[PDB]
Each structure stands twice: as C-alpha cells, then as structure tokens.
C-alpha cells in the first residue's frame, strides 16, 4: 500500500441562481401558503409566509 | 481554602456562585465542605508624593 | 473494515455512518481503533461479522437497528422471499488473512 | 396468556386542560439561584389533555388504546388502589422490531428493551396475583434493568383518590429519559390545578425508534376493575423562563407563548412587571410545517458508469466532464467502492441531499 | 441625521464580517450545525457591534 493505484474523482460545485441541473434525492411535498412555514426551494431554506 | 458552614446535598460536589464561580467544594476523601476564596484582595491604594 | 474507520466520527457520511452506527454532533469522548487482522481473520474466511446495507432512512445518533425484514428496493411489493428487486438487508464481511 | 377481554364499553376519551403541570429539567447543567431562558420540548400551559377511565359500575370500562409518541409525552394518573402498573413503548409492537416494556410487579420495577410479540389486548391481573398476560415471547434481547418500584399493591378499596403520579418521557440521542413527581391529593373526579416540577428519575440507554405507545392496566380476576384514570399530553417546542433556587430546583416558570402578559414577563426577564407600557417581541407564532420544492429531474446520475471505467486517465492529462440533468445519489455506490477518502470543502457531506447545484464538473485521474 | 443613522443600520446587514456569506439562510443550507456555529457567531458579533 502506497505503490498501489488510487482512482481520484474531484467534483466542483456551482450554486449560482440559474436553474438547477443536479439535485439531491429529497422528495417534494405539496406547497402551502398564507402560513408561517419552513421551506426549501432548490436547496435554499428559510422561514416565513 | 477554609472551613465552611455551608450544607451541600448528599450527592453534590461543587457549589456555584452568582457570577458562575465555584464557591465551596467537597473534599473527596474527607467528606467536608471547603469554601474557595480568591487570594487577590481588591481595594489597595498607594499614597505617594512625587 | 479497514477503509471505514474514518466514518466513525461526528458528521460523516457512508453506509457505516448512515445505516448501522451514528455519532451525535455534540459528542464528548474518544474514538479508539486498531488493526485486528491477527485474531479476526480465518484462513478459509471469517464470515461472522455482518453489516446493514439497505435502510429506508438514516438512523439517529446512538440508535440501533436489529430487524432483518426484506428490503423493498423495487416498485412492486415483495414477500418473505427475496426474488427480484428485493434483498436481504444484512451482508457479511469477508475477512481473509491475505487481504490488503 | 393471549386472551381477549369481553364486556368493555368501547374507547371514548374525554378532554381537559393542564394549567401549569409538566415542567421538567432541560439539559443537565447544574444551575442555582438564577433566571434562565431555555428552548426545549415542554408541555404548553393550558393544553388539551386526553382523559381515559378505568372503572366498573355492571358495565366494564378498560381504556388501553394505542397512542402516538411524538417528541415525548406527559403522563399523569390520579389513582386509588394502583390499577395502572406500566407502559409499552415501540414502533410496530410485534416481533419485527424491538420494543421497550416497563412493568412494575408487587416488589420491583422491571425495564427491558427486547423484541416482544405483544397480544391484541395486553393487561395484567391479580387475584394473590396472576400477571404477565401481555406478551408470549421475546427471544433476542438487548437491555435489562431492575430498580425500586413506583406503584403500590393492587389490593384495596376507598371512596376518593389519594395519590397523583406524573411522568415525562423523552427519547433523544438514544436515551430514554424519565422524570417523575409523587404527591398526595384528595380530588374526586378531575386533574388537580397547580404547578408541578418533575425531577430526573432514570436515563436508560435504549437506542430504539419509538413512535407508538400504550398503557398496561390491572384487572381483578367474572372480572372487575377498580376506579382509576390516566391523562395524556404532548410536548411541543417552546421557550420557557425558569427560576432555580439554592438547591438547584425549579420553583416557578412562565410559558412565553401563552398571552401578552407572559410575553412581557419573558421579554423583561422577570417574574413581575411594573405598571406601564412595554415593547414586546416575537409573539410566538412558531412554524409547524416544513415543505420542500425540487425540480422534476428523476433519472439518476451515472456514478456507476463513471467509476466503472476500464481506464480513467493519466494524472498529467486528467479528463474533465460535466454532469447535468440527473439526481446525485451517492448511496448507489455503497456495494461497490467503499471510498477510502471523502473530504468536502465548500459544503458539509451531510447536507448534500438537501442541495441543488447549477452545474457540476468531474475530474478523473489515477495517482 | 436620524434617518441616515437608521438607513446605515439597515444597510449594515449585508456585511460578511469574515463569514462565508452575509445571508444567514445560505449557511445553515450548506453547512452542518457544529461547523455552522463559527459563521453564525461571527455574524452575531458583527451585527451586535452595529
Ligand atoms: C480514603 O482513604 C484514606 C486512606 O486510607 C482514608 O483516610 C479516608 O478516610 C478514606 N475515605 C473514604 C471516604 O473512604
Ligand atoms: C421510526 O419508525 C418509523 C415507522 O414508520 C419510520 O417512518 C421512521 O423513519 C423511523 N425513524 C428512523 C430514525 O429510522
Ligand atoms: C382478539 O380479537 C381480534 C379481533 O377482534 C382477533 O384478531 C384476535 O385473534 C383475538 N385474540 C386472540 C388471542 O385470538
Ligand atoms: C383549565 O382547567 C381548569 C380546571 O377545570 C378550568 O377551571 C380552567 O378554565 C381551564 N382553563 C381555561 C383557559 O379554560
Ligand atoms: C382539545 O384538543 C382535542 C384534540 O383533538 C380536541 O378534540 C378537543 O375538542 C379540544 N378541546 C378544546 C376545549 O379545545
Ligand atoms: C414473532 O411471532 C410470530 C407469530 O407467532 C412468528 O411468526 C415470528 O416468527 C416471531 N418472530 C420471531 C423472530 O421469532
Ligand atoms: C417481581 O419481579 C421480580 C423480578 O426481578 C421477581 O424477582 C419477583 O419475585 C416478582 N414478584 C412478584 C410478586 O411477582
Ligand atoms: C437473534 O437470535 C438468533 C438465535 O437465537 C441468534 O443466532 C442471533 O445472533 C440473534 N441476533 C441478535 C442481533 O441478537
Ligand atoms: C432545599 O432548601 C431548603 C431551604 O430553602 C432546605 O430546607 C431543604 O432541606 C433543601 N432540600 C433538601 C432535600 O435538603
Ligand atoms: C461494470 O459494468 C458491467 C456491465 O455494465 C458490470 O457487469 C460490472 O459489474 C460493473 N462493475 C462494477 C464494479 O459494478
Ligand atoms: C453486492 O455485491 C456483492 C459482491 O460479491 C454481491 O454478492 C451482492 O449480491 C451485491 N448486492 C446487491 C444488492 O446487488
């Protein structure tokens, strides 16, 4: 070990505000409004109405 | 360290003060309460001519 | 396994850290590991150490799962038999003395 | 024995409200002679409390339904002759998954996290005594614990209740915490009104997933049940102001969400407010729903194809490719690779399932 | 003077104060909590000094 090959993959991320192309496996719930809730829009979280 | 008249709970070991300071500690070997006082005395003023 | 010891730490990801053992984010203590190829490897292969491979969701810190129910990895529901697209959730380590 | 009960007049609970009961000790830091604000899962003041009965008049009434266990519960029981004797905690309440059983017999309390097969109608009985008619077998077992009892002998008869027993159950970090307080009351047919603080009792390390629970009752056995009642409440995330005395015991508390007066008290960090007009803040409209909105991409990223290549690259001529329009699921490689190195810099590895990226690049080489 | 003081107090909310981002939302979105405490503490110190 030390003279044996290692396969290296490095991923570079780019958040930006353009439409998302790669996403996590999270499931999407139905949308509600007029109510103080916790939301998650394309990875952007927050709390409000 | 000095001798203290404070009474601890049977399972207590430390005593905390208002400003999150240790007041009295129970000796692990001889189960007696010893109060802790800083050895620095504030309020010393030096009067001197020039 | 030798390559999964890094997953025994607060805030790690992987099958070990997601399916069978998780540490709290405010953990206070020490983690100790050492190579045990001397007395945990058998010439024909030691297959008495098992790990979980499939679970519906990640487990909470210091939580244990013991259940051995068949895992539904496909659209169609399955039964006690494995069949197609449904697997036994527990898999056994393969430990040989000549392993790297 | 696995025997159903006959002659019960259905399960129909009544409702009431708990004025100021259910305050316990958050965390474990020692505090004395101070006022602190703490955020935790408390039982809010004047919250609706489910009420169940256990009496015979000659129609029997035994209330042992299956209730939900979400973020912990508050359990209280006005009692005479000790009909209530234990609880069942678990998620499926059968042989599939482990369950927690808390049972007090005539001399000791028995706690064991085990894999039970509970029957349809679990209950204890006593003649003399004849009990343990709640399960059939447990087989593989993990935990066991025996200590001093909490409840008294099932025999006896009176006209009014004598004791009130309050419990708080929580499940955090693989620990089953129990808080209790025992007080004598002379009430007739209701939960007492007042303030109660519950001291820590046990810290059992269980490490099981608990979602559902039910109560164990004692019948006399052609069977009769003595008069008893128990009450169920649910904890919710609130902010409380607590006062500690020199013993390190809570003596008073205010719920900062109850009304504007409690809001002013919590804002000013004092149990009494002078005459005037005070600016309050955060009128405690705490959210209770969490929503997620993600795009319509459903196909999975070809991580297996990328990692399965016959040859990757030379390090001096590393190959770069773009990944787009897929779902990043690292769990599909768990049976193949077992990454010996996985370090992330701009993000935390546990937040990858919650994030969406505009574009991703992948560089491959062998060193 | 009073209006300018209030406006400056509002506009100071976009300062990073040495954190990765001045937006509180995209720190808890990207960083796990015990790593996020450092950024949150820097932001708290700056906004409390203002
Ligand atoms: C601890 O041991 C010392 C030395 O034998 C003895 O003097 C002391 O009384 C002991 N204390 C306790 C609490 O046993
Ligand atoms: C606990 O069990 C319920 C039963 O459906 C399940 O939905 C939940 O994901 C489990 N929790 C964990 C942390 O595995
Ligand atoms: C009790 O009744 C239920 C249905 O009411 C039945 O499924 C169950 O088998 C009965 N108990 C026993 C021990 O047979
Ligand atoms: C709480 O319960 C007591 C006792 O029944 C009752 O008098 C009181 O009105 C209840 N609280 C409210 C806000 O109704
Ligand atoms: C209390 O809450 C329960 C929850 O279902 C509800 O059934 C009951 O009507 C409520 N009572 C009052 C007085 O709001
Ligand atoms: C639990 O009980 C059921 C019914 O008696 C049985 O089929 C099952 O095998 C039991 N589980 C175990 C682990 O023995
Ligand atoms: C109560 O349970 C304990 C188990 O530790 C046992 O030793 C004792 O004999 C039991 N007593 C009765 C009256 O069932
Ligand atoms: C379950 O029981 C079987 C047979 O008693 C035993 O071989 C196995 O090791 C047990 N598993 C656990 C997780 O206790
Ligand atoms: C609690 O403090 C009181 C004094 O306010 C004291 O009388 C009492 O003994 C203390 N509790 C215990 C258990 O000693
Ligand atoms: C690579 O792909 C081939 C065919 O698609 C498959 O048989 C093989 O198992 C894959 N390799 C790995 C390590 O999964
Ligand atoms: C995981 O890989 C091993 C390789 O020997 C294979 O035997 C097993 O069937 C695989 N599991 C699944 C669920 O494909």
Short mmCIF file of C-alpha atoms in Angstrom, two decimals, chain A residues 15 43 45-46, chain E residues 25 28-30:
data_model
loop_
_atom_site.label_atom_id
_atom_site.label_comp_id
_atom_site.label_asym_id
_atom_site.label_seq_id
_atom_site.Cartn_x
_atom_site.Cartn_y
_atom_site.Cartn_z
CA UNK A 15 -24.60 27.20 -6.75
CA UNK A 43 -31.67 23.94 -1.61
CA UNK A 45 -34.07 27.30 3.08
CA UNK A 46 -35.79 29.81 5.31
CA UNK E 25 -30.09 31.30 5.19
CA UNK E 28 -27.47 26.59 7.51
CA UNK E 29 -28.33 25.39 4.00
CA UNK E 30 -24.73 24.43 3.15
#
